[PDB]
Amino acid sequence: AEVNDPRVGFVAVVTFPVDGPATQHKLVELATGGVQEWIREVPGFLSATYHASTDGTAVVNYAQWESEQAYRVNFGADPRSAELREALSSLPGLMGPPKAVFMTPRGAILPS
């Protein structure tokens, strides 16, 4: 969705500390892999965008949700998200556990 789409009521920014670019690409490919296709139909899910920090030390997901309940229950209570957590957590190269910051969009500066 557009960064300022008014449907976005809740964002999760999740950072995975990784040992380098190879693991960045390996973490990227695994979490956008095709097997994770059920997230696409999760109700209230708006988007998950994965990024590679420029210094090769991290993968950051900026995820857009309709609400905190959508993220917490619709996605989170589903057994497959537990499956997903372990998977990304067992990846060689991860240098620690992901760190998540939860937030609400409050204002946007866009071009006219």
Site string for ligand NOM, 47-86 (x = CB under 6 A): -x------------x-x-----------x--------xx-
Smallest separation, CB 44 to ligand NOM (Å): 10
Our finding on whether 58 is near a second copy (CB under 8 A) is yes
CA pseudo-torsion sign 4, 109, 59, 12: negative
Among 4, 69, 89, 104, contact with ligand NOM (rule: CB under 6 A): 89
Cβ atoms of 58 and 95 within 8 Å: the answer is no
Cβ atoms of 10 and 102 within 8 Å: the answer is yes
Binds 78: which of a second copy, ligand NOM, none (CB < 5-8 Å by kind): none
Backbone angles phi, psi at 62, to 5 degrees: -105, 105
